[PDB]
Amino acid sequence: REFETIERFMRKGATGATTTIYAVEADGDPNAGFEIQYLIKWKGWSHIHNTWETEETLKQQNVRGMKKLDNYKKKDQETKRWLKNASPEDVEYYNCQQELTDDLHKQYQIVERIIAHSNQKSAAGYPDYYCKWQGLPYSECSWEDGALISKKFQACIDEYFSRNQSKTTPFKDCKVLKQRPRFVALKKQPSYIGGHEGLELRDYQLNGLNWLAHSWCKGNSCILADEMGLGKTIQTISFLNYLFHEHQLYGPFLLVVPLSTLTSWQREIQTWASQMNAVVYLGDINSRNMIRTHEWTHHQTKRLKFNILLTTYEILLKDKAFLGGLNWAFIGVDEAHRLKNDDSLLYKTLIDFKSNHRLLITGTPLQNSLKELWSLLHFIMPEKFSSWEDFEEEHGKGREYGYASLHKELEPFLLRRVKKDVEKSLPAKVEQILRMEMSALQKQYYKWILTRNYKALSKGSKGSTSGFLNIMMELKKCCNHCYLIKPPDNNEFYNKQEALQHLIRSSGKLILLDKLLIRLRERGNRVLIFSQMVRMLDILAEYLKYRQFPFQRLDGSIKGELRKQALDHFNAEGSEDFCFLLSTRAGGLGINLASADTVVIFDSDWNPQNDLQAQARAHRIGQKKQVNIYRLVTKGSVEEDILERAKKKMVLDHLVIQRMDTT
Amino acid sequence: TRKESYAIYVYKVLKQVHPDTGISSKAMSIMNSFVNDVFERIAGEASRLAHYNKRSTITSREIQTAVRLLLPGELAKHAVSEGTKAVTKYTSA
Amino acid sequence: KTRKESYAIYVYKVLKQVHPDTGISSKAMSIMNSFVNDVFERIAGEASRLAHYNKRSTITSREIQTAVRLLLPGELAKHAVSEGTKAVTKYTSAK
Amino acid sequence: ARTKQPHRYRPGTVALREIRRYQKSTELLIRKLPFQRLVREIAQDFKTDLRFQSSAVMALQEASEAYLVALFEDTNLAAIHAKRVTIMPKDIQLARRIRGER
Amino acid sequence: HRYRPGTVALREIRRYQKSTELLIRKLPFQRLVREIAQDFKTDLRFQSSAVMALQEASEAYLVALFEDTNLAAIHAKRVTIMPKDIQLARRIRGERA
Amino acid sequence: NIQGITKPAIRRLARRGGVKRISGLIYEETRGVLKVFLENVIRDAVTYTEHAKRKTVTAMDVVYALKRQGRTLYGFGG
Amino acid sequence: RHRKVLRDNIQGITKPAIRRLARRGGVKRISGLIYEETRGVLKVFLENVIRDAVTYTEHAKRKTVTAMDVVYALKRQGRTLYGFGG
Amino acid sequence: TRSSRAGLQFPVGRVHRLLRKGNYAERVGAGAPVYLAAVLEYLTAEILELAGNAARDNKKTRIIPRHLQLAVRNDEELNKLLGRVTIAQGGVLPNIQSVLLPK
Amino acid sequence: AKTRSSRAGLQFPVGRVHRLLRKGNYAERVGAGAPVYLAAVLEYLTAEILELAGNAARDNKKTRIIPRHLQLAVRNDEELNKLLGRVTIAQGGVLPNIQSVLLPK
DNA sequence: ATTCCAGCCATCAGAATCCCGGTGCCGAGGCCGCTCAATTGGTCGTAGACAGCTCTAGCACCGCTTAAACGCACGTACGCGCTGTCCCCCGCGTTTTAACCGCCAAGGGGATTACTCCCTAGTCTCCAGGCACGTGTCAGATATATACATCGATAGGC
DNA sequence: GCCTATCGATGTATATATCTGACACGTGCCTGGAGACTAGGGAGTAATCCCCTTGGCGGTTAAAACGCGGGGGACAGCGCGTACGTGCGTTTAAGCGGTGCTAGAGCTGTCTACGACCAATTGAGCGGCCTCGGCACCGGGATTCTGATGGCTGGAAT
Ligand SMILES: Nc1ncnc2c1ncn2[C@@H]1O[C@H](COP(=O)(O)OP(=O)(O)O)[C@@H](O)[C@H]1O
Ligand code: BEF
């Protein structure tokens, strides 16, 4: 059938080069007489050029980008008008915010690590050096004058050269992998640990290090489940350092640290284990390319230069290819309970990573089912636990002897030391549950939700009736605060002092919370608020801004770089921040705060282990004072219903766990 | 439980026309939907023909007329030829 | 001559109930009969397809209701549904 | 010693490239999640507390994209008819009216 | 006396839109229908109602096509219909695509 | 025979459509489109007639053919 | 700071999305008023389809809209879709 | 009889017979034909009322296809129901585009 | 053989078509030849579509028929385009076509 | 100081529907009788209505990356108004061809009816197409490669 | 105001080498299709007869058909100006991974109500007639455009 350009917008005479770090050292401030301007910022040049400049200097050089000044003018006018009307308390909050922000900005000027050096020996003795930025990703790396960097940052060039000349970097072939050496008992802390500062590991840490070493000599991987607050990471880095020195093993190591805890690990690997080079493999694609170019391979030998990496799960997943061939011996994982669901892509990714020793670090590995514990055990040695059905039949529930069998088999693979058995100095935790009655507005919204009479809630609100497809999550919102379901009408009250009263009376919980916070304020105790609803944090922040001192915040939207500063400011001695707003899943895990005496759980997670994790953020090694924990519960509401499940689960878990001790 | 479809028969047709070629699952679903649609269309036209002529039965002739009404030109002619051949071979048994 | 059924006697009663002093010619009547036939056929086809899709062997009143809602515009659909419900209620009353 | 002591395509070149690219690619163009949001919002007006199977939204998106593409083709023909190159709302209106959409 | 171009056109528009009679001569249409059918089967007979139905359908189709053509013409800011208008109308309708 | 559809007839049909001015080329196009429509309808009409084993094309055949083509006609039966 | 404002869901069919759909249709130049018109047309189409889909769902005593409901709704409008059932 | 019980002028028995001898479903419910008859009667009543109104507007007293066409095309809902339907002798709705009218 | 498709020499299921017609409420009776005829028609249409789909696939250097290939085959054939004129094939896209008036001379 | 086009109204011939009365057809709408199809009453057996139960799979977050959306700047291409020329159509008169109507005649095909017998639906027993589920591993998704057609658009040939 | 020529650089395309998930075959079993057999209604005829389609013909207007002039639209070429495209830096939110729950989508199974299929029987609706009014006709009636004479002046021009 071409001229420079402005980057951003932040006495008379002080301008130009003389104000730069080349001359301010010799002449300081050219004038400091009795108008005002803001810090220099140019597109294309490093921040280390900080100076004080005037409106005319840009014009004189004909810098392209003057038209950009209009937005800055808008900002200036808005700030001027807004600040005057701001209440004195809000003014204080804003001033503290500015004070912290300028310090954040300045921190960039401090160079952390020289990355590369140019063959052009300027002045025949000053090669150009590629300088890293403190608190900024590798994407911002720029070359700087060798002499200039030496004047203010001499030591860093010595660091980079010494590391470059070093030969401790790992090698592809190792005889240790073929046959493990004989175990040697560590009777006392080696002198090289802690450095000249003489830092001493606590005894239980030394015992755990001995246990981990013994397990390594047998070739068996292990799970470390030390009770939260005992410093698991210190023991991990101690094992790494032991592998370094007492075995001459400088093999690749890969610690998958969460994002919130990355900086803590980095600081501790710099203080401890200073003999090892660390690479924080975080940032955008370009920054990772920069690392993979400069800090990855020793081009003169094609050998690996790094010792310990610091990656997150989300980044490791998105670059799983590159590491797949560069097999690492010591693939460590922190906050390992993410591996409790073997189907999760992290499990399938890491299980294909050829590793010789994997150590999981999780405070509460027991979790809600034996399957999760089996999953972790499988991650230890896939050969010995390759079958689920066999394990299930071998450990049939109900019979009492099976639990003792479990506690026997776990002992060589899982190590855990309760606080009371290793450090009695720590004050005992105080747990109190404060019932509270729902407010009348809460009761009316609750009645409407239960009847699903959307007609009432819709009055003057954009809420969608289809958003009620999960009544549990809306009942929880109603219980917490009315504003979550129905945004408050800002036109009802123009005076803040009245809107604050309405906000307080709107939520029954706040009626107790404000009084509790004031009473703790009298004692001078700092308070940590953990909540699993991020909008709840917004509500609480708005409430705080009216009355109390500046507060730091930690939720998943806060970029990592700022979390370092927030944590340091709250922890730093002399801090005035009254309380810390921490989202549970983001900030409740791992971070070592140890600077507060109250931990208030606004809303309870479906999983009590997360709540226990949050409580332990304060109750850590650094606490010199007892911590009082208050769990908020709304009487006559589903929140108690959740707590009943929590009680059953907790009783069962405690009964099982207590069998581990020979009491 | 069991859902019945034309997957295997379309696959046989494919391995007759293009032995090497394969067929993705969504392509197979598309072909199944097309077969169902043409089936229902021809059946409906045949039913209308029967009701109009006050018949009570659908015969090969009704299907032939439905094909002539639905498919255009050469497609209809070839479909009619194939149907006549199939019926003849069936009777020849 | 064999018998050709039609709705003439019914359309005429409806006309004499909405407009007593009015009449209808032989072609307007044919148009009305065709319209009735077309609406019947489309509603019946909707009911049949609804039944087959839902794997059911009966054309219930509810099938006709959904068919009318699918086919007629909003206001016509609402009025037709109301009248059908009333008719069904009255029919079931004399049980 | 640093011490401190362009190309531009013309209007229409990229449009043709986009035309070719999106005629070649079959990938869905509207972002899935906002379309799901709009589908749910519209459905709310008919029956509250409705649930949607994941394939229902996909089918609706495919049908809507195909309908919009056909409408844009007709609109482009209408614009060319007026000896123009820009599609304007009256072009869509004419296309719909001819197609018979009220 | 002599009307300006356009007046009689609107007069005819009003005359024919108001009325209902068939516009095409019946006998030429009968001949066209018979000729078209001849290619399919010889000796065919047509009921008068069949021819009238075909005429009604054809007139309705042509009137609708002319309305669409008029809309297309106005789109180009013209007032006179020309073939490309019919072609555009058909293509948009899907008849010729 | 197609010429039997004369210029005045197409003129009148255009008038009913609201056309005020008609180009001289519209007539051939109208004749062609009419021929195509007639062919499409008549083929189905004959097909229906042939199935019935008849020789006279009835009005019902035309009605069925139009209903297939989406041109439902009321006035003769259905 | 954020003023708690939220954009309309209809505005979620962004200007680049209409631009891309136009590109697939062969459109070289797009007037700025097309976008609102396109949004309205899409809303009307979705309303027409979803009405029939919801009716079908209600008939089955179901509270979930299934792909077959959408297929049937589109088939009613003469817009048969393939690849999701039949 | 089965129509007086429903108060419908249309025939329920004929609708039942057509539903059964129509190849629509294996069996047909008792209530289906009454519903269908009521719907058809309502539609006919609406069309006839509009047609009679149109006839009054023309001073005639006998409905003819012109009247039905006018009624259908002047009602948006009825026009949408019968969009693809052409009525013999119905003519067209008087509609002259503005651009064609004189200044 | 014991299978009605072998007798007719078709691949499509003649008995399944007979079941569908018999259960679809299309008519009160179904002849023996109607299933065979309909099965043959369906088989021919499937073969016609698949030939073009495979040709399009081989043009793109592919080996599996995807919806794009089916759409290309359907839209590039005048007859199949009329039969499937109102059919939207998911994930099939559209035929490449740029109006002349848009490209420069 | 003076004035002719557009222009508000103008005012008066025609040229049109329309408005009206007559006249008078014929198709409505009413009545009659009688068929057959709808109604009443009965048994009868399965849809399907309801209940109880298992898990998909659908919803609601948080968290975090990172690509796409967004806002703004620049300039140039297209739109839309405008003017002017030309030809193409409209309107009208007069001639020519053919519809249209009425009465008539034929016989061909639709319609109908009696009678027959063959093919289909309904029931039963008995497997082997068919499908769910599992699985091993090539085709395609995906990195990194250069190779190849030009936004122009700049510089020199007239 | 033009031809060609190279890279302000740019984005497709056409090559590899992974690796990875979807897809092409295998295997158990249980439903559904296929061999038997039967009953009986519907389809298939051959007759008959009635209508209504086809074809003739003569007169008889209506329409179609040309032919001409001149008005006003079509359509081209020109000229502003603005809104659209392109491109960049910044932001937003989609997308995806992980964690919870549980509403509700499908199934099984029980047994009961309500349709199907009968039989008598009876009245609604059908075809067949029959006889006036609604609506054609068709005037001359009125009157409602409508285009060319018109009066004037403002405005730009004299
Ligand atoms: N060996 C040690 N000696 C003294 N203090 C220690 C030691 N190990 C840990 N710490 C304290 O623990 C804090 C770090 O907590 P860390 O154990 O890193 O948290 P994580 O639970 O994430 O491991 C530090 O502030 C430090 O003061
Ligand atoms: F318990 Be640790 F701070 F993770």
PDB file of N, CA and C (backbone and C1' of nucleotides) in Angstrom, chain J residues 118-136:
ATOM      1  P    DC J 118     -31.021 -27.063   7.659  1.00  0.00           P
ATOM      2  O5'  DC J 118     -29.772 -26.135   8.010  1.00  0.00           O
ATOM      3  C5'  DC J 118     -29.818 -24.754   7.699  1.00  0.00           C
ATOM      4  C4'  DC J 118     -29.543 -23.906   8.922  1.00  0.00           C
ATOM      5  C3'  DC J 118     -28.333 -24.328   9.759  1.00  0.00           C
ATOM      6  O3'  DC J 118     -27.429 -23.229   9.868  1.00  0.00           O
ATOM      7  C1'  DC J 118     -30.223 -23.938  11.133  1.00  0.00           C
ATOM      8  P    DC J 119     -25.957 -23.406  10.481  1.00  0.00           P
ATOM      9  O5'  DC J 119     -25.808 -22.174  11.492  1.00  0.00           O
ATOM     10  C5'  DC J 119     -26.516 -20.956  11.271  1.00  0.00           C
ATOM     11  C4'  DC J 119     -26.678 -20.194  12.572  1.00  0.00           C
ATOM     12  C3'  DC J 119     -25.443 -20.170  13.452  1.00  0.00           C
ATOM     13  O3'  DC J 119     -25.427 -19.015  14.279  1.00  0.00           O
ATOM     14  C1'  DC J 119     -27.115 -21.474  14.505  1.00  0.00           C
ATOM     15  P    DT J 120     -24.030 -18.355  14.716  1.00  0.00           P
ATOM     16  O5'  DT J 120     -24.306 -17.821  16.203  1.00  0.00           O
ATOM     17  C5'  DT J 120     -25.483 -17.069  16.482  1.00  0.00           C
ATOM     18  C4'  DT J 120     -26.239 -17.640  17.678  1.00  0.00           C
ATOM     19  C3'  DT J 120     -25.432 -17.754  18.972  1.00  0.00           C
ATOM     20  O3'  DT J 120     -25.715 -16.673  19.866  1.00  0.00           O
ATOM     21  C1'  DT J 120     -26.893 -19.642  18.615  1.00  0.00           C
ATOM     22  P    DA J 121     -24.988 -16.615  21.301  1.00  0.00           P
ATOM     23  O5'  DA J 121     -26.023 -17.309  22.322  1.00  0.00           O
ATOM     24  C5'  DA J 121     -27.335 -16.771  22.497  1.00  0.00           C
ATOM     25  C4'  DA J 121     -28.086 -17.432  23.657  1.00  0.00           C
ATOM     26  C3'  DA J 121     -27.396 -17.401  25.008  1.00  0.00           C
ATOM     27  O3'  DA J 121     -28.373 -17.427  26.057  1.00  0.00           O
ATOM     28  C1'  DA J 121     -27.431 -19.639  24.190  1.00  0.00           C
ATOM     29  P    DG J 122     -27.937 -17.333  27.599  1.00  0.00           P
ATOM     30  O5'  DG J 122     -28.043 -18.846  28.118  1.00  0.00           O
ATOM     31  C5'  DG J 122     -29.303 -19.530  28.115  1.00  0.00           C
ATOM     32  C4'  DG J 122     -29.148 -20.956  28.621  1.00  0.00           C
ATOM     33  C3'  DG J 122     -28.210 -21.097  29.818  1.00  0.00           C
ATOM     34  O3'  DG J 122     -28.743 -21.993  30.792  1.00  0.00           O
ATOM     35  C1'  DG J 122     -27.444 -22.472  28.050  1.00  0.00           C
ATOM     36  P    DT J 123     -27.982 -22.179  32.194  1.00  0.00           P
ATOM     37  O5'  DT J 123     -27.337 -23.643  32.092  1.00  0.00           O
ATOM     38  C5'  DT J 123     -28.160 -24.771  31.787  1.00  0.00           C
ATOM     39  C4'  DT J 123     -27.336 -26.042  31.693  1.00  0.00           C
ATOM     40  C3'  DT J 123     -26.328 -26.235  32.824  1.00  0.00           C
ATOM     41  O3'  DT J 123     -26.450 -27.531  33.364  1.00  0.00           O
ATOM     42  C1'  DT J 123     -25.246 -26.449  30.730  1.00  0.00           C
ATOM     43  P    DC J 124     -25.798 -27.870  34.788  1.00  0.00           P
ATOM     44  O5'  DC J 124     -24.494 -28.722  34.408  1.00  0.00           O
ATOM     45  C5'  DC J 124     -24.634 -29.967  33.703  1.00  0.00           C
ATOM     46  C4'  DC J 124     -23.311 -30.440  33.125  1.00  0.00           C
ATOM     47  C3'  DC J 124     -22.126 -30.376  34.087  1.00  0.00           C
ATOM     48  O3'  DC J 124     -21.722 -31.690  34.431  1.00  0.00           O
ATOM     49  C1'  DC J 124     -21.548 -29.596  31.889  1.00  0.00           C
ATOM     50  P    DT J 125     -20.637 -31.933  35.587  1.00  0.00           P
ATOM     51  O5'  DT J 125     -19.324 -32.321  34.766  1.00  0.00           O
ATOM     52  C5'  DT J 125     -19.426 -33.257  33.702  1.00  0.00           C
ATOM     53  C4'  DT J 125     -18.123 -33.371  32.935  1.00  0.00           C
ATOM     54  C3'  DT J 125     -16.877 -33.451  33.805  1.00  0.00           C
ATOM     55  O3'  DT J 125     -15.990 -34.434  33.296  1.00  0.00           O
ATOM     56  C1'  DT J 125     -16.714 -31.566  32.353  1.00  0.00           C
ATOM     57  P    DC J 126     -14.615 -34.749  34.056  1.00  0.00           P
ATOM     58  O5'  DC J 126     -13.550 -33.885  33.242  1.00  0.00           O
ATOM     59  C5'  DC J 126     -13.545 -33.938  31.816  1.00  0.00           C
ATOM     60  C4'  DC J 126     -12.454 -33.064  31.248  1.00  0.00           C
ATOM     61  C3'  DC J 126     -11.197 -33.004  32.106  1.00  0.00           C
ATOM     62  O3'  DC J 126     -10.032 -33.136  31.292  1.00  0.00           O
ATOM     63  C1'  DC J 126     -12.003 -30.811  31.720  1.00  0.00           C
ATOM     64  P    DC J 127      -8.703 -33.815  31.879  1.00  0.00           P
ATOM     65  O5'  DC J 127      -7.959 -32.604  32.602  1.00  0.00           O
ATOM     66  C5'  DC J 127      -6.752 -32.082  32.061  1.00  0.00           C
ATOM     67  C4'  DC J 127      -7.018 -31.205  30.849  1.00  0.00           C
ATOM     68  C3'  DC J 127      -5.919 -30.192  30.547  1.00  0.00           C
ATOM     69  O3'  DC J 127      -5.832 -29.930  29.135  1.00  0.00           O
ATOM     70  C1'  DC J 127      -7.885 -29.046  31.182  1.00  0.00           C
ATOM     71  P    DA J 128      -4.459 -30.172  28.327  1.00  0.00           P
ATOM     72  O5'  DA J 128      -3.908 -28.701  28.042  1.00  0.00           O
ATOM     73  C5'  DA J 128      -4.414 -27.958  26.939  1.00  0.00           C
ATOM     74  C4'  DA J 128      -4.171 -26.473  27.128  1.00  0.00           C
ATOM     75  C3'  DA J 128      -2.706 -26.068  27.235  1.00  0.00           C
ATOM     76  O3'  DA J 128      -2.508 -24.759  26.720  1.00  0.00           O
ATOM     77  C1'  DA J 128      -3.778 -25.585  29.262  1.00  0.00           C
ATOM     78  P    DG J 129      -2.466 -24.516  25.134  1.00  0.00           P
ATOM     79  O5'  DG J 129      -3.304 -23.168  24.924  1.00  0.00           O
ATOM     80  C5'  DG J 129      -2.682 -21.899  25.135  1.00  0.00           C
ATOM     81  C4'  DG J 129      -3.704 -20.830  25.473  1.00  0.00           C
ATOM     82  C3'  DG J 129      -3.121 -19.447  25.687  1.00  0.00           C
ATOM     83  O3'  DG J 129      -4.077 -18.432  25.421  1.00  0.00           O
ATOM     84  C1'  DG J 129      -3.810 -20.365  27.772  1.00  0.00           C
ATOM     85  P    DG J 130      -3.626 -16.891  25.400  1.00  0.00           P
ATOM     86  O5'  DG J 130      -3.523 -16.489  26.945  1.00  0.00           O
ATOM     87  C5'  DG J 130      -4.699 -16.387  27.734  1.00  0.00           C
ATOM     88  C4'  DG J 130      -4.366 -16.048  29.180  1.00  0.00           C
ATOM     89  C3'  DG J 130      -3.283 -14.993  29.351  1.00  0.00           C
ATOM     90  O3'  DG J 130      -3.832 -13.861  30.002  1.00  0.00           O
ATOM     91  C1'  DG J 130      -2.838 -16.905  30.756  1.00  0.00           C
ATOM     92  P    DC J 131      -2.937 -12.565  30.289  1.00  0.00           P
ATOM     93  O5'  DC J 131      -2.686 -12.641  31.857  1.00  0.00           O
ATOM     94  C5'  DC J 131      -3.641 -13.271  32.690  1.00  0.00           C
ATOM     95  C4'  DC J 131      -3.192 -13.252  34.133  1.00  0.00           C
ATOM     96  C3'  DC J 131      -2.211 -12.146  34.486  1.00  0.00           C
ATOM     97  O3'  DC J 131      -2.231 -11.890  35.873  1.00  0.00           O
ATOM     98  C1'  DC J 131      -1.093 -14.186  34.596  1.00  0.00           C
ATOM     99  P    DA J 132      -1.892 -10.431  36.444  1.00  0.00           P
ATOM    100  O5'  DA J 132      -1.187 -10.744  37.845  1.00  0.00           O
ATOM    101  C5'  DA J 132      -1.833 -11.612  38.775  1.00  0.00           C
ATOM    102  C4'  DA J 132      -0.827 -12.278  39.698  1.00  0.00           C
ATOM    103  C3'  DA J 132       0.260 -11.349  40.206  1.00  0.00           C
ATOM    104  O3'  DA J 132       0.427 -11.496  41.612  1.00  0.00           O
ATOM    105  C1'  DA J 132       1.251 -13.185  38.992  1.00  0.00           C
ATOM    106  P    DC J 133       1.429 -10.526  42.404  1.00  0.00           P
ATOM    107  O5'  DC J 133       2.782 -11.368  42.433  1.00  0.00           O
ATOM    108  C5'  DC J 133       2.724 -12.786  42.574  1.00  0.00           C
ATOM    109  C4'  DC J 133       4.102 -13.400  42.458  1.00  0.00           C
ATOM    110  C3'  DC J 133       5.251 -12.470  42.833  1.00  0.00           C
ATOM    111  O3'  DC J 133       6.187 -13.158  43.638  1.00  0.00           O
ATOM    112  C1'  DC J 133       5.562 -13.275  40.625  1.00  0.00           C
ATOM    113  P    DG J 134       7.407 -12.376  44.326  1.00  0.00           P
ATOM    114  O5'  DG J 134       8.680 -12.958  43.559  1.00  0.00           O
ATOM    115  C5'  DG J 134       8.781 -14.365  43.325  1.00  0.00           C
ATOM    116  C4'  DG J 134       9.896 -14.670  42.354  1.00  0.00           C
ATOM    117  C3'  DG J 134      11.169 -13.864  42.596  1.00  0.00           C
ATOM    118  O3'  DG J 134      12.264 -14.733  42.821  1.00  0.00           O
ATOM    119  C1'  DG J 134      10.522 -13.775  40.295  1.00  0.00           C
ATOM    120  P    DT J 135      13.689 -14.139  43.253  1.00  0.00           P
ATOM    121  O5'  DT J 135      14.503 -14.126  41.886  1.00  0.00           O
ATOM    122  C5'  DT J 135      14.266 -15.131  40.904  1.00  0.00           C
ATOM    123  C4'  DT J 135      14.856 -14.715  39.572  1.00  0.00           C
ATOM    124  C3'  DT J 135      16.152 -13.929  39.692  1.00  0.00           C
ATOM    125  O3'  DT J 135      17.283 -14.751  39.393  1.00  0.00           O
ATOM    126  C1'  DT J 135      14.593 -12.854  38.155  1.00  0.00           C
ATOM    127  P    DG J 136      18.770 -14.189  39.631  1.00  0.00           P
ATOM    128  O5'  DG J 136      19.347 -14.003  38.153  1.00  0.00           O
ATOM    129  C5'  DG J 136      18.950 -14.886  37.106  1.00  0.00           C
ATOM    130  C4'  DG J 136      19.491 -14.406  35.779  1.00  0.00           C
ATOM    131  C3'  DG J 136      20.851 -13.744  35.861  1.00  0.00           C
ATOM    132  O3'  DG J 136      21.575 -13.922  34.644  1.00  0.00           O
ATOM    133  C1'  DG J 136      19.173 -12.101  35.396  1.00  0.00           C
TER     134       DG J 136
END
